[PDB]
């Protein structure tokens, strides 16, 4: 099993970021994958997410909770670049401007164990 | 050696036929009228001529080997070029597939947002409906209490309740039907 | 019971104010000029009126509960419709991906066919070149034998070999350079979207 | 791992055949997969092939041999619909008209030992 950065090269990823930002300027591209060794949670089919600008982290958390088919009681952690900074109230634009990768994407991982 | 046709020694050379013969072959009709010399007279001349010919042929064979190496290198370069082009085409198609995935994700998120909005609107309308049903039940209980209790209970403030029932405008819930669209194979036509 | 403002019994009913009062309240300015009746006089009329009102309210409450069930069933139907539309969109994208795979396979096979043609042409030309090199080597060996052996060996058929070498037209190999094209799908669909 | 008929339904496959015939009428669509229990040969990345009409079985067999990276001495079996009919000289158009599936594709399988 190969991750996203292993399926595509760096320049290809930068070109993808450029083309997507040219097509969807009002949205942010986010790559969300399961942890390397997580067993309690399944693997989502979709890997790429376009999140509006004005939207905060709460809507993204709710999108992930809806995709994963999770009951309300159980909670989960959504780490950015492998490290949590879940200021749920902050808009995702600030998260993008602060913690985006070198290629231009915003990488996140979900776990619970 | 000796001649097979006549039996004499082959000590002569015919300038016209370039064949060594005997003296009997010179007078016969086979080599009649031709010019005949001794082998030793033209030996050195033909020797140096063939020496220069050998030198030239060595040079030309080196050139031909160079041409062979050239065509080998060309076919190698062409196989490399074809491999490069195949990888390039596959990478372009993979790029197309990636942007296709991104567009699919965008459309899916749009539809999920629409579903969430519709569901929350309908939930608010359902809350309004259950509130109005509970209000109806409350008014029914109040009228029952009025009709079972004292005369003053029945008559006190009766016109207010009567007029409140007169203005009974029942409220309809919000609804929508078939005013949405999803989504075309024009790329198939362009080719 | 008795009145809180004056202390007399509440046996009256004001048609205008709809409040039960006493006789002292009828003469004061609070209920002056209104029409006043006895409570026992309007009991049956208001009783049957409120009975009909209760009937209407029962019917309307039944209708309202039906409306509630209707909106619940509608939101269920709408979630079903949204699921249908999502599956439809995913199927359309899968169709597009499949035809893309087929086009990629077609282009790859075309390039491989072109490579095969070029390689077979170059192999035939290389066969010609190696044959001519072997012919050169054979002539060189014959000339060596001519220069080392007897005088009769040197002179027999020497003009034939000389004339064979005179017509030495060396053959060039076949070649082609950058006369091919193989364009894939240009991102015009991105503008179409 | 799911085969082609398991990844797509029957009507979807018929529609794919129709679209391909509309786009490439001069070509035949062929689906080639590895045998269910063959181990000596690996699994190819590509599954779909568009083969011209005039082309015979020899070009398809050699394409499969080149994709699998096999020397000339080692041989393999290419069965159509689960039954061998490798008349290498016959054109692929006749093979398609004779042994095509119900949906419209042409299914083949490659194997080797036993
Ligand atoms: Zn003689
Ligand atoms: Zn003569
Ligand atoms: Zn009073
Ligand atoms: Zn009054």
Which CATH number is A90's domain given? Answer: 3.10.20.90
Tokens of D10: 């029957």
d(CA D75, CA C49): 101
CA of C40 to the centre of ligand 4 (A): 17
Do the bridges between strand A77-80 and strand B12-14 make them parallel or antiparallel, or are there none, so unpaired? Answer: unpaired
Q: How many residues does chain A have?
A: 113
CA atoms within 13 A on the CB side of C29: 0
Cβ count within 10 A of residue B101:
15
Cβ atoms within 10 A of the Cβ of B82, count?
19
DSSP of B53-91, one letter per residue? HHHHHHHHHHHHHHHHHHHHHHHHHHHHHHHHHHHHHHH
What residue numbers bound the domain in which D88 lies? Answer: 1-114
CA of B42 to the centre of ligand 2 (A): 16
- The minimal CB distance from C53 to the residues B57, B162, B170 is found for B162
Half-sphere exposure of A30 (CA within 13 A, CB side): 29
Sequence-distant (6+) residues with CB within 8 A of B115 are: C78, C79, C82
Integer angstrom CA distances of residue D16 from C84, C162, D10, D102: 22, 70, 10, 13
Tell me how far apart the alpha carbons of residues C35 and C14 are, in angstroms, rounded to a whole number.
6
Which DSSP state fits C29? G
Q: Which pair of tokens denotes residue A83?
A: 């490290």
- In sign, the C-alpha dihedral spanning A73, A79, A83, A87 is negative
> What is the β-pairing status of strands A106-111 and A77-80?
antiparallel
For residue C78, the SS3 value is: helix
Q: C190 Cβ partners below 8 Å, 6+ apart?
A: A19, A23, B99
Contact flag A19-C190 (C-beta cutoff 8 Å): yes
Residue (of D86, C100, D64, D99) closest to B97 by Cα position: C100
Reference C99, options D64, D50, D43; nearest CA is D50
Kindly provide the resolution of this structure in angstroms, with one decimal: 2.7
For B48, other C-beta atoms within 10 Å of its C-beta total 11
D positions 39-98 inside 8 Å of B (CB):
none
The C-alpha atoms of residue D31 and residue D6 are separated, in whole angstroms, by: 13
Q: Which contacts (CB < 8 Å, 24+ apart) does range C103-106 have? A: C103/B93, C103/B191, C103/C185, C104/B89, C104/B90, C104/B93, C105/D46, C105/D48, C105/D49, C105/D50, C106/D24, C106/D27, C106/D50
Can you say whether residue B178 is alpha, beta or left, with left for phi > 0 and alpha for psi between -120 and 50 degrees? left
Q: Considering only CB atoms, which chain B residues are within 8 Å of C42?
A: 155
Q: C155 vs B56: CB contact, 8 Å cut-off?
A: no
Backbone phi, then psi, for D52, in 5-degree steps? -60, 165
Those residues with Cβ within 8 angstroms of residue A106's Cβ, 6 or more apart along the chain or in another chain: A28, A29, A30, A31, A80, A95, A96, A99, A100
Tracing tokens 């930002």 back to the chain, one arrives at: A21
Secondary element (H or E) of residue B20 = strand B20-21
Q: How many CB atoms lie within 10 A of CB C100?
A: 17
C106-110 CB contacts, 8 Å cutoff, 24+ apart = C106/D24, C106/D27, C106/D50, C107/B89, C107/B93, C107/C182, C107/C184, C108/B86, C108/B89, C108/B90, C108/D46, C109/D49, C109/D50, C109/D51, C109/D63, C110/C182
The answer to whether B84 touches C192, Cβ cutoff 8 Å, is: no
C-alpha distance from B173 to closest chain C C-alpha (Å):
7
Q: Which of C99, C105, C112 sits opposite D19 (nearest CB)?
A: C99
**Which residue carries 């053959």 as its tokens?**
C171
Long-range contacts of C10-19 (CB under 8 A, 24+ apart): C10/B152, C10/C39, C11/C38, C11/C39, C12/C36, C12/C37, C12/C38, C12/C39, C13/B155, C13/C37, C13/C38, C13/C39, C13/C41, C13/C42, C18/B155, C18/B156, C18/B157, C18/B158, C18/B159, C18/B160, C19/B156, C19/B157
Determine, for residues C95 and D20 on separate chains, whether the beta-carbon distance falls below 8 Å.
Answer: no
- Chain D residue with the nearest C-alpha to that of C107: D50
3-state helix, strand, coil in chain B (%, to 5): 70, 5, 25
For residue A113, give Cα distances in angstroms to A37, A108, B126.
9, 16, 38
SS3 A72: coil
CB atoms within 10 A of CB A74: 11
Asked if D20 and D100 count as a contact pair (C-beta separation under 8 A), the reply is no
User: What would you report as the CA-atom Rg of chain D, rounded to the nearest whole angstrom?
Assistant: 14
Interface of A with B in 16-45 (CB under 8 A): 16, 19-20, 24, 27, 29
Question: What ranges make up the beta strands (E) of chain D?
Answer: 27-34, 48-52, 77-80, 106-111
How much distance in Å is there from the Cα of B37 to the middle of ligand 1? Answer: 15
Q: From residue C90, give the alpha-carbon distance in Å to each of B107, C97, D4.
A: 10, 11, 18
Between CA B114 and CA C82 the distance in angstroms is: 9
Name, in order, each residue with C-beta under 8 angstroms of C4's C-beta and a sequence gap of 6 or more.
Answer: none
**Dist. CA D45–CA D22, nearest whole Å:** 26
How many independent structural domains does chain D possess?
1
What element of type H or E holds D70?
none
- Helices C39-148 and B39-148, interaxial angle, to 10°? 170
How far apart, in Å, are the Cα atoms of A6 and each of A1, A30, A102, B100, B149?
A: 9, 16, 15, 19, 82
DSSP alpha helices (H): ranges in B149-169?
Answer: 151-155, 158-166
Q: In chain C, what residues touch A19 (CB-CB under 8 Å)?
A: 187, 190
Token couple for D101: 């599936």
Across the beta sheet with A48-52, what order do the strands follow? A48-52, A27-34, A106-111, A77-80
Closest CA to A20 of C46, B61, B105, C175: B105
Enumerate the domain spans of chain B: 35-177
How far away, in angstroms, is B16 Cα from ligand 1 center?
16
d(CA D23, CA D3): 24
Question: What is the token pair recorded at C96?
Answer: 């597009």
* Cβ partners under 8 Å of residue B163, min gap 6: none
Residues with Cβ < 8 Å from A108, sequence gap 6 or more? A30, A31, A32, A33, A78, A79, A80, A81
């Amino acid at each position: 099993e190969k991750t996203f950065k292993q399926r595509r090269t760096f320049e290809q990823r930068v070109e993808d970021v450029r083309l997507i930002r040219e097509q969807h300027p009002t949205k942010i591209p986010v790559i969300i994958e399961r942890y390397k060794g997580e067993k309690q949670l399944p693997v989502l089919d979709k890997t790429k997410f376009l999140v509006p600008d004005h939207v905060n982290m709460s809507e993204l958390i709710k999108i992930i909770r809806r995709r994963l088919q999770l009951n309300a009681n159980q909670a989960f952690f959504l780490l950015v670049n492998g490290h949590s900074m879940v200021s749920v109230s902050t808009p995702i634009s600030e998260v993008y401007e602060s913690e985006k990768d070198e290629d231009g994407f915003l990488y996140m991982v979900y776990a619970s164990q | 050696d000796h001649c097979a046709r006549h039996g004499e020694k082959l000590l002569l050379f015919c300038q016209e036929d370039s064949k060594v013969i005997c003296w009997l072959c010179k007078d016969s009709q086979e080599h009649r009228g031709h010019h005949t010399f001794l082998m030793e007279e033209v030996a050195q001349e033909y020797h140096v001529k063939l020496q220069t010919a050998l030198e030239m042929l060595r040079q030309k064979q080196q050139e031909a080997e160079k041409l062979e190496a050239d065509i080998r290198e060309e076919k190698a370069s062409w196989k490399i070029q074809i491999d490069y082009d195949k990888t390039n085409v596959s990478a372009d198609f993979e790029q197309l597939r990636e942007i296709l995935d991104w567009e699919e994700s965008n459309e899916l998120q749009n539809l999920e947002k629409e579903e969430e909005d519709i569901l929350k609107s309908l939930t608010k309308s359902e809350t309004e409906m259950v509130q109005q049903t509970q209000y109806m039940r409350e008014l029914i209980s109040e009228l029952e209490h009025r009709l079972q209790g004292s005369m003053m209970d029945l008559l006190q403030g009766v016109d207010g309740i009567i007029k409140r029932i007169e203005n009974m405008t029942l409220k309809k819930p919000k609804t929508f039907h078939k005013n949405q669209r999803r989504v075309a194979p024009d790329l198939k036509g362009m080719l």
